[PDB]
Amino acid sequence: RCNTQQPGCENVCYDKSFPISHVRFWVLQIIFVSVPTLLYLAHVFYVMRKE
């Protein structure tokens, strides 16, 4: 909420205050931190099949 009667002010002020939400930022962080292990697991699986 904001103290004003100007239409559209709340939208822009919220957008400026929070360019991105914390929760979605953390979701991106965890996905990025997790991808390399998945890649390594897939590589090991295929190498084991070839061996």
Ligand X SMILES: CC(C)CCC[C@@H](C)[C@H]1CC[C@H]2[C@@H]3CC=C4C[C@@H](OC(=O)CCC(=O)O)CC[C@]4(C)[C@H]3CC[C@]12C
Binding residues vs ligand C14 (CB under 6 A): 19-20, 27-28, 30-31, 34-35, 38
User: Is 30 near ligand X (CB under 6 A)?
Assistant: no
Phi-psi region of 2 (alpha: psi -120 to 50; beta: other; left: phi over 0): beta
Site for a second copy (CB under 8 A): how many residues?
4
Stretch that binds ligand X, among 4-12, 13-21, 23-31, 38-46 (CB under 6 A): 38-46
Count residues near ligand X (CB under 6 A): 3
**Cα distances (angstroms) measured from residue 10 to each of 7, 14, 40:** 8, 6, 46
The one-letter amino acid at 48:
M
